[PDB]
Design a protein around this nucleic acid. Sequence first.
DNA 1: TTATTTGTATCGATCACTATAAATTT
DNA 2: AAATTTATAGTGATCGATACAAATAA
Lengths: 192, 193
Amino acid sequence: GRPRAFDRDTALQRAMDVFWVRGYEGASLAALTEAMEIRPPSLYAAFGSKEGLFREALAHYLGQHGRYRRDVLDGAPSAREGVAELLRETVARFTSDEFPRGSLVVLAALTGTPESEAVRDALSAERGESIRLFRERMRRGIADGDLAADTDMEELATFYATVLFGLSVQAKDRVPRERLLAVVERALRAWP
Amino acid sequence: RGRPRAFDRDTALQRAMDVFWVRGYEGASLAALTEAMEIRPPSLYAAFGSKEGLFREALAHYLGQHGRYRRDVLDGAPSAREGVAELLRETVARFTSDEFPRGSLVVLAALTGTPESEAVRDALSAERGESIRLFRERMRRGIADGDLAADTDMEELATFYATVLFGLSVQAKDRVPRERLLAVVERALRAWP
DNA sequence: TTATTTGTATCGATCACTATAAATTT
DNA sequence: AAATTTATAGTGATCGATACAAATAA
């Protein structure tokens, strides 16, 4: 029939940016439909609802900013170099302006009304996946021999995840890239 | 002179702060605030002027009643390392108590939002800068006291621990068990120079 | 009488979300 | 045409913030 005037993945990209800056509940459909360059009935045709548009923008954000994480981790010769390389590239992405500062998963919905709890729980489970990414790379380190067998991998993974999440708050606070890279270097001194 | 106010203004302020603590600034609807404060809208505005003003008063209340331990724990410690350790250990305790909302209001209440509330977002961001400054002040004392080296980068060390501190609000909100978060604090202190 | 607080009822604006039909197709 | 996306123009509900008058003090 009549052709579609927008490109799906491009409207999904602009919806992702608005969420990245205003958050899930902070993003009105006025601001969204303005960014995507579509009209409300077009938006609800492709995405179902505001929540459905966020879940698709989350999957979009993740595939474009959450797959580079495991590539850097497993591409390093040791678990310590993986955590170092991934924390350094994260600080780079957190401090260049090709994107907004900080991670969408950390910033988009930490608190809110009871109505948007499903969205908040989604971002919560995704933060647990960051811990799992760390913990999985440490399991390889113990097997490769570069990490002691009696290492508390859950504590080490959670510690560096705490630092990872904290860097989103610091990047949003406009802390310079040089100071964030010193945080990463200092956090590595805690390695066993 | 006039009709007397029928609510404790100190108690109402506490109840707004508890709603802001869980729902954030924009998430706290005026229907929800007046419901917890147990008052009605025109009273709220007579007392606090506006939602923004009510949060700004709730913030100062939260800071003096739930952030008073920070300076005390920091100052009463015999070394800079013990003050940072004890502050984080105490923060994890409060962050994981069954008695208060998990995490810190300052980090959780307004990280992102509409352009209308940037004044509130910058207020909380300035208060997070104070957390960095508060650590920095203690390390300053540690250099004079002798427990810290006279050439230590006070900002680099304070900012690192402020990063760990902010991340603990997110982990507390994610209901990470308390023993886990104390292990995190111990690991972070291993990075001390 | 005056002064301040109270509950009620409502404000204009904005929220997320659609009915409806013209526009553009094979 | 028959199919499908478009834009206009709204929906009721809720947002933050009030006009008003009964109530209650000095």
